[PDB]
Symmetry: D4
């Protein structure tokens, strides 16, 4: 596996002239107002990944933000509700063309109640992702090799999952449901940033 590690931003977009890009983030925690973005990982689906270390207080990443803003490229996330929130909070741009594997799983893998990425990758691809490094110091000046490999493992498989989930959504005739959910997901993330992160806005109570 090829993992290219960068400081601050991509050098250029030569490797990301594609129709869909897998995106994930790492942070110091679950609360975007307290816990800063530390790492962004990207993959074109070609079996390689880019891992971009974000500096404390960094407000801009022009090449990355160009990728995030381009409406002709679908951004694939797992539980994008969080990643969209932290990305918009950090760089000020909210992506609006997204696919979320957690929503897709909840709309298709109706035979289980376990929708985490580890379980999805295990069941659909028989690939074992080890989550031991998920809780680690992502703000370290130098990431360990184990950290880098874990960070890359989170984007290496999202394209294959998207392909399978699109097949399942077509088979079970839920394409318009998923499309509407993905269309609303950026506003769910914005609501999270504004202060309703603990509130189901559509619930009766």
């Amino acid at each position: 596996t090829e993992i290219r590690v960068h400081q601050g931003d991509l050098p250029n977009l030569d490797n990301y002239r594609i129709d869909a890009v897998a995106v994930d983030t790492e942070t110091l925690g679950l609360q975007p107002h307290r816990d800063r973005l530390c790492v962004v990982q990207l993959s074109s689906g070609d079996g390689t990944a880019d891992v971009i270390q974000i500096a404390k207080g960094q407000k801009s990443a022009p090449n990355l933000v160009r990728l995030l803003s381009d409406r002709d490229i679908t951004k694939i996330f797992h539980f994008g509700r969080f990643d969209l929130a932290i990305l918009a909070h950090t760089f000020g741009v909210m992506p609006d063309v997204v696919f979320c594997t957690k929503i897709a799983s909840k709309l298709t893998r109706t035979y289980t109640d376990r929708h985490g990425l580890k379980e999805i990758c295990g069941e659909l691809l028989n690939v074992n992702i080890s989550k031991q490094q998920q809780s680690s110091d992502w703000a370290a000046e130098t990431l360990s090799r184990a950290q880098i490999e874990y960070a890359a493992s989170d984007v290496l498989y999202l394209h294959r999952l998207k392909d399978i989930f699109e097949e399942r959504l077509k088979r079970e005739e839920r394409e318009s449901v998923a499309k509407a959910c993905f269309q609303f997901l950026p506003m769910r993330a914005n609501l999270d940033l504004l202060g309703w992160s603990e509130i189901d806005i559509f619930a009766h109570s």
Copy 2:
């Protein structure tokens, strides 16, 4: 107050050449697959209401459905998540231009945790709605006068609430949030009809 009671459908749309119509329903319960639609109430905001008794097994109401399908007329609901579901299940047409006072309350009345219609009407208008008839036999062949007055009371005030809530949403700069929520609300109702009524599709667990 003028309450016109009809059987099956409106006679015509002469009274509903307006930009927004208040809509509510009554049913035999909270589960659209088990509990049939029994009454539909409408108001143009002029202080009068129409109460339409729906027969068992009735599949069509052409004038009402014409109103519900007209994209130039905003349908105002309180907790439209339910009403949209039961209306689409009964007549096969899902409205797509809606305003929901419960979502608006949750986005604006942040100083309270009580978002029911009774509390909203009491606080915003100092009008006391009595909910005693909410749990009654709405499938009766002949509705009582108390039932008819209660049913009318649920639509008589939605226009005034919409006006106030639009003022609050503009004041607190949440118009685009509310618009996106209202745009997603019909798909939330469809998800309810399809079997995810007990599932927050965006939650981590």
Copy 3:
């Protein structure tokens, strides 16, 4: 209202040559193995009631038990799961032709979650039953007038409820469901006596 109070048993069955009899009990508590049967109340539906005081250790009541065993007479209960259990535990005979207003309410009053006798009588008949004496010393040698009137009030209305509930069950096409539930109710009561009173025998867990 006419309330005839008896010691031990009915003098005869001259007043109970009817197709359905309303039955209720009072006890020292909810656990038949600890809490003895103290009072049995009966009504033919003619606006009068019989209140039979049961002595401590009494094992037999031949006229009452003749009524309870007669398969040509439907026994009407409210929450018969309990009354059947305590009656079978006390006299050794389990009725097998029953109607239960709580099951009927749960199968028909789907628009509410309150299925107690007070709420049913209030909604369906606009009659106010006062439950203040429900928790009182039913084992007293001499019952107070308030106790006797309360005990009679629990059977005076069950016929009218049965008539209305049968109308609702026919209207909503649930007659065979109710019939099967009533057929199983005596075995649910037997299961209670045998030790599964806290167990839903049909639940997954």
Copy 4:
């Protein structure tokens, strides 16, 4: 072990001229209105099994339904409350002669609170069933060998369990209790289909 895999239906009933047949199903989930029947497995108890793949939208399976409707053949299930519901929803025929190993376990294995099939098979027969494939894509056009073996393992042992449970029910004198529970089980399943799947119809609250 011999596992015969069929498409749509049994070719004939030559192998099922027997007094009792073990039956199980697999679906896309726990909610019959959303989650379609995908596989039906059968065994005569001779150590072989039939696994029948059900197509999307299939409404009829005449040989299977003939077996399911024949009152002279007892259908053995584990947690038949679910299987009866999905079978009746799919093919329109509700079996009325059934035996359920979960009810039997709850009536006899009173020394444990674990009544799942894995635990029952482990304790009563010392046979280890692996449930890893229980949550898998049962709607796949081609089932994997592991899926087929898992599906067969669920019916291969129900006859032996029925024999042991009948011995236990006779020993502890609960035969009439079990018989009444099995008689009510199809109506419990019907109640599930009608919308009371989350309601204990006999509970006080």
Copy 5:
């Protein structure tokens, strides 16, 4: 009603040459190690009461302690588990001849789940005790008249309750159960003082 208010101790025992004395306490709270004893109330059952104000840091009350230690006099409490604990903690003497109306209620008033003193007095005697002053500053140098009347009301009726409860215990044949419970109650209070106040020492977990 006659209420004699004393500072520190009774002047003598001339009024307490009796077979049973009603006893209650008031404190600054539910935790004897933090919340000091402030008032002790006594009654002989003759319709009069003594209310003894206890000073901060007071370690001795010889006449009161003589009464508390005399094994020929039954001390009547309501929820004596607490009063015994605070009395033993304050004066160093644990009474060993006691009657508790809460234990008696739980052993006899099996038809209710409300065993507080207010409910018992209301049901058994039709006397309304007002608990408004229960949460008040009992450490005040001068108690208000309302406080004094409330404090007296808690002992004025315990003799009558004891008489009725003894009748009920005899009637239901639970005398030896109650006697054993009362014999253990002082050790339950000691266990509370030693640090097991939140632990059911006899529970499995």
Copy 6:
């Protein structure tokens, strides 16, 4: 009662040359990052109050902030954990000489579990505060008379409570405990602003 209503700030500090000032706030809700400060109320303890309407986006209030920063003047709050947070978030100055009636109540009113301002005022002073206006639109351009009177009622009594609580703290020898709690309270509020509002920082879990 004299209530002086101001826009933006006090005109001067001529009325607040005192040793302690009662302070309270009103907001659009419980979350300082979402819900802006709308009203600040002050009282010198002389039976009059000042009610200062804060404009949207207002960042400065020099006379008020001078009062809040003056270390020679004790700021009295009820549940100052919140008020300190919203004041520091709005004007950028955290008071460091405070008294909190909720902490004082929890350290002295150990005989009750109700520590709200209404209950404290009722018990200690026999004054009835009506909280009906607590949940109202505090951002209105013009406050109603009822709103103004409610806002003033929250500061009119804090001096008298402080006097009584200081007496109780001296009597029960908890002065150094209270002093340390008040010294830590501003940092508890800062922790709230930083993102630990839902976390007991000292708990084991």
Copy 7:
């Protein structure tokens, strides 16, 4: 290890002329009114055990009951609350000289919250008891060797535990507390048989 298996009763008491006997039971479940006594195991502490199979409906075991009734012999149990209940229910004799290792553990092993027999034996003696057979069919006509060895393992170590716990109770000065708890334990078991098995008779609620 020597395990003597008997049918119905001990042949004689020649091996049980001792000051303390370890006692345990096995049943069909936790509810003495439903779940019959199946096995009784005894040990004198000499490293051997007696396992007595109890027949269905057996009402008498004269040698065993002689042992159970002899006040000069302490009966050692683990969680005797249950064993005393089932023994008294089966043979009609309640032991009144008992020692319970669960009460002793709760009074001495204050540094842990795990008081089960497995954990106690592991910690105090470094002996590993395997509980796999705890949930098995104890009513089988012929017990398996594994069942017999498990049943014997439950009494083989109670003497050593009693010795250690008596040392701990003396060291921490809790002997009179334990003695009072053991004195009350038979009445706690009687209360269980009478119907208060789910009630803490000493709790406030």
Copy 8:
């Protein structure tokens, strides 16, 4: 590793002329009023430890208390809320210069919810601490070698953790927050001793 075991007290302070000392305790349980201090462990950070056995009823340890009272030496704890309480309760001196690794973890390891010492040591240092002996008889006259090694393992690493946590607190700019928390920690422990151990003194409820 060098572990020096002492009885009662250190012989002298020759090894503890340092700027910071790691401190931990072992007790008979979590409740200082019931569960006595049994062991105190200390380390200077040089890879050696002192383990001091405390006798029952011991009130003084002059050299240890001299160390605990010296304001020029920072005492490092893990969850010092407990250790401070038990130390002050036993020897009457409350340390006032402390560092707590649990507070530091909650202020810095925001990417996890597991703040126990085992997890911290595993993540930050890759050192595996085995907690098997945590629940053991610490009051034994002679500690086992395994107990001594476990007790030493709890102080051997606190200096390294303090160094890392100080780096993290500086990096994330939370030094003044941590300092204020550490300043309040002794009063939190005092509040625990006084009776508020189960109360969040700053919570609204």
